[PDB]
Amino acid sequence: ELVRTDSPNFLCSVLPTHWRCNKTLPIAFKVVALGDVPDGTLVTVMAGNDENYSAELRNATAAMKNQVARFNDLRFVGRSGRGKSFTLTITVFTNPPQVATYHRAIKITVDGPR
Ligand SMILES: [Cl-]
């Protein structure tokens, strides 16, 4: 089950709306390229908001392999903040680079969904 991003050339797996800090994701994160994206193209993931430009993430780097970039255990270490969420920004380093944003924001707190 994939969802589209704000970029028509990219799709990605579904992420929770709210999750616990540093806890493994329920669904392994991956970015699917629909267009021309050569194998070996680096892809980085970044999370942040107004207060936090780039929050600490774990395993936020991957490389394209046959139109797919799989992230090995992506985790949100840093918390989004009280009453705030994160905006996931995907950057596919093609020539030139293409940026995509997750269709929705993700909240990261110490306890997670209560
Ligand atoms: Cl952080």
UniProtKB/Swiss-Prot annotation:
Q: Name one GO cellular component term.
A: chromatin
Role noted for this protein: Forms the heterodimeric complex core-binding factor (CBF) with CBFB. RUNX members modulate the transcription of their target genes through recognizing the core consensus binding sequence 5'-TGTGGT-3', or very rarely, 5'-TGCGGT-3', within their regulatory regions via their runt domain, while CBFB is a non-DNA-binding regulatory subunit that allosterically enhances the sequence-specific DNA-binding capacity of RUNX. Isoform AML-1G shows higher binding activities for target genes and binds TCR-beta-E2 and RAG-1 target site with threefold higher affinity than other isoforms. It is less effective in the context of neutrophil terminal differentiation.
GO process terms (BP): cardiac muscle tissue regeneration; chondrocyte differentiation; hematopoietic stem cell proliferation; hemopoiesis; myeloid cell differentiation; myeloid leukocyte differentiation; negative regulation of CD4-positive, alpha-beta T cell differentiation; negative regulation of granulocyte differentiation
Region Interaction with DNA, annotated ranges: 20-24, 75-83, 108-114
Induction info reads: Up-regulated by phorbol myristate acetate (PMA).
Quaternary structure, per UniProt, is: Heterodimer with CBFB. RUNX1 binds DNA as a monomer and through the Runt domain. DNA-binding is increased by heterodimerization. Isoform AML-1L can neither bind DNA nor heterodimerize. Interacts with TLE1 and ALYREF/THOC4. Interacts with ELF1, ELF2 and SPI1. Interacts via its Runt domain with the ELF4 N-terminal region. Interaction with ELF2 isoform 2 (NERF-1a) may act to repress RUNX1-mediated transactivation. Interacts with KAT6A and KAT6B. Interacts with SUV39H1, leading to abrogation of transactivating and DNA-binding properties of RUNX1. Interacts with YAP1. Interacts with HIPK2.
**What GO molecular function terms would the record report?**
ATP binding; calcium ion binding; DNA binding; DNA-binding transcription activator activity, RNA polymerase II-specific; DNA-binding transcription factor activity; DNA-binding transcription factor activity, RNA polymerase II-specific; DNA-binding transcription factor binding; protein heterodimerization activity
Question: What's the protein name?
Answer: Runt-related transcription factor 1
Q: Which organism is it from?
A: Homo sapiens (Human)
The chain positions of domain Runt read: 1-114
The subcellular localization recorded is:
Nucleus
Q: Where does chloride 1 bind?
A: N52, E56
Designated gene of the protein: RUNX1
